[PDB]
Amino acid sequence: ESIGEIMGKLMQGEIGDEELSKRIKEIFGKRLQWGYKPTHQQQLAFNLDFIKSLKEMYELPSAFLEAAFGKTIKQSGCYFKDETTTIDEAEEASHELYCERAQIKDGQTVLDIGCGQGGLVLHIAQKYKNCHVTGLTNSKAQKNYILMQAEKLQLSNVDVILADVTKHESDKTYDRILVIETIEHMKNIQLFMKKLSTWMTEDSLLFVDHICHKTFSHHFEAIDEDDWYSGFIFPKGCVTILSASALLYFQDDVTILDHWVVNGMHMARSVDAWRKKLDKNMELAREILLPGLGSKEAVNGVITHIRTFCMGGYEQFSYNNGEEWMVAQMLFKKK
Amino acid sequence: ESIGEIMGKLMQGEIGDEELSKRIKEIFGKRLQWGYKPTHQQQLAFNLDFIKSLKEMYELPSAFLEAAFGKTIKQSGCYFKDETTTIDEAEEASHELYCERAQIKDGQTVLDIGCGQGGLVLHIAQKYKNCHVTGLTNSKAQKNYILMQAEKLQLSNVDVILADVTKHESDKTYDRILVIETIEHMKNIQLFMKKLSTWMTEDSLLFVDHICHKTFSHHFEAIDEDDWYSGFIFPKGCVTILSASALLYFQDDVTILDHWVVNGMHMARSVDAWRKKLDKNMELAREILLPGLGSKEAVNGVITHIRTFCMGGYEQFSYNNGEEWMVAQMLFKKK
Ligand SMILES: Nc1ncnc2c1ncn2[C@@H]1O[C@H](CSCC[C@H](N)C(=O)O)[C@@H](O)[C@H]1O
Ligand SMILES: Nc1ncnc2c1ncn2[C@@H]1O[C@H](CSCC[C@H](N)C(=O)O)[C@@H](O)[C@H]1O
Ligand SMILES: COc1cc2c(cc1O)cc1c3c(cc(O)c(OC)c32)CCN1C
Ligand SMILES: COc1cc2c(cc1O)cc1c3c(cc(O)c(OC)c32)CCN1C
């Protein structure tokens, strides 16, 4: 059976969830076989080859996002204390975790790089009224959404920079720089970390959170010709999954102070919550999307893409009870 | 059975090798249980706690050493291509490995920190006649031994600094700094790496080789009250076994370029060769030591200490076919 065949059935909703999960799990299983080496000697050779290679290198309506994601439309792994923790509670808990680990204090200047729909920006601005908080995003729609929310919440300490971070030039420095699930999209990491360091003083801290594998790094791309999934989710070679330790080798310009991971079940529960919420609001979602997309068929295509992303993410992050793919966090100071 | 009881039998040669190996293997097994955590989250918490803690902190006659060790009296893990590779061949192969990985080139100034009996110093000086090679050791006997060997080998490009490296002050810089199995003895690693960086220019490289565990760090000390071994081998708290990645968190002053490990079977074969050679030359060894030690009993004590070190090292490094304790190597440049 070809890719086209599987893709055809998928788009027609003719693959049941059980089979879909099974198929995607197997694709990730093959990635694990690709990434694990028989000896630590070989593991490090493999990992260093990857690190060396790095050193050489339409928008959805907000009503739809509100129908699929949690309250602040967080698009990153959340943190679930309990089995019954809601996605809204999990977003808040993860915002609080970042504030704790990045050592946020009232009065600081804070920059959130690739801030998305600005959940973290709004959380810090509300919690710490004397902080000034800047979000940076390359999306005009996201900028507009954040500014509207800040206005509704009576927050006067928020601004948003609309920029491609890789092109942004500024002399401005910040007490705290946060990068939540943006670094996976960065084509040139050494240059990225260097740029960030120029926006820090000797008193600043940099906090990065990124999806990872605990042992090895990989580009998010087809493992072989039987992998219909990877390229469906990201039709471009634009996402890298760093190992949990990969950024330790990018200390040219910043110096590590602390290092954590969060078990993958938290991310698994995040994507599960999104999937279930989308499913609950399926009819509403289809109504919202129809104007901007033009046909029920294009609508179905967008929904299938997002739903499959969640189904696949579930298998990826829940693999071996969260002990394969997970979330890495690091705290750095400037050199 | 108490420590005293086991120690008594050991000193009397009443513990057979099979039982001795079994006992020491069990001690290391308990260390593995202590060091491995159930989740990567917990593993990193454990490892970072260790790294944070670090950031707060009679000579044997040469004739005896010649009778127990290989030709250049290398006192570090060697490299064995084949089952029949001799200790002399393995010393040379490991010297060549260091030259390759540290990117030694003719004409460079080279500093070997804690150079021991100077095998590496003499190897580089002979292979690269336009290099100047300096060994640094805190032992006057080692300095004297190296200078004698340099004279016998018609080497004119060797000097030796007699110094405690932690106290040595100099404005001199070197193209290459090598640290082979010395860092395990360094009480203040952050300060050590900082000092090394002051002896480098922008063109220099620093190569470190250290005994490690692939996953976690530990002080070499009694795991519990049943551990007679650890404190027998090092009666002081003076040896730390860093994890294979521990030095990645010490890039305040230097920046990593490359990272390897060498499987533990090489070290296992090294200590095995020493043990077998000592055993072969047992009578001669006892004759050599008697003058300086004063009695057959003191002689037996020194021999038992060294032989047990080799027997225990065998169990440590061969554990799980070399995939627990092993040798880590890193290459760095100056910040
Ligand atoms: N070059 C670039 N400049 C700015 N933002 C970018 C970027 N490349 C990607 N991004 C944005 O980075 C974000 C990563 S998704 C995470 C969003 C937010 N930090 C959250 O946790 O919810 C996306 O919004 C993506 O579009
Ligand atoms: N503070 C210090 N200053 C200088 N040398 C030291 C030192 N602490 C330990 N050493 C020496 O460092 C050496 C580590 S043993 C390894 C010796 C040599 N590099 C080899 O590979 O054979 C020992 O000689 C030890 O006595
Ligand atoms: C679950 O695994 C991944 C998830 C995401 C990703 C890469 C992943 O591996 C990058 C995507 C993305 C988005 C929203 C979102 O909610 C996401 O889930 C966290 C992701 C929006 C677009 N870009 C940033
Ligand atoms: C095998 O495991 C270890 C070995 C050694 C060590 C710590 C170890 O864990 C430190 C000792 C030491 C010595 C000679 C020698 O040949 C050694 O074997 C490599 C060691 C001399 C004294 N100091 C440096």
From TrEMBL, chains A, B:
Lipid metabolism found in the keyword field: no
Key word Metal-binding present: no
Gene Ontology MF terms: (S)-tetrahydroprotoberberine N-methyltransferase activity
Binding site for S-adenosyl-L-homocysteine: 75-76, 138, 142, 164-165
Keywords: Methyltransferase, S-adenosyl-L-methionine, Transferase
Highest taxon listed in the record's lineage: Eukaryota
GO biological process, one term: methylation
Binding site for S-adenosyl-L-methionine: 75-76, 164-165
SUPFAM superfamilies tied to this protein: S-adenosyl-L-methionine-dependent methyltransferases (SSF53335)
Uppermost EC category: transferase
EC assignment: 2.1.1.122
Assigned protein family: Belongs to the CFA/CMAS family.
Designated name of the protein: Tetrahydroprotoberberine N-methyltransferase
Organism: Glaucium flavum (Yellow horned-poppy)
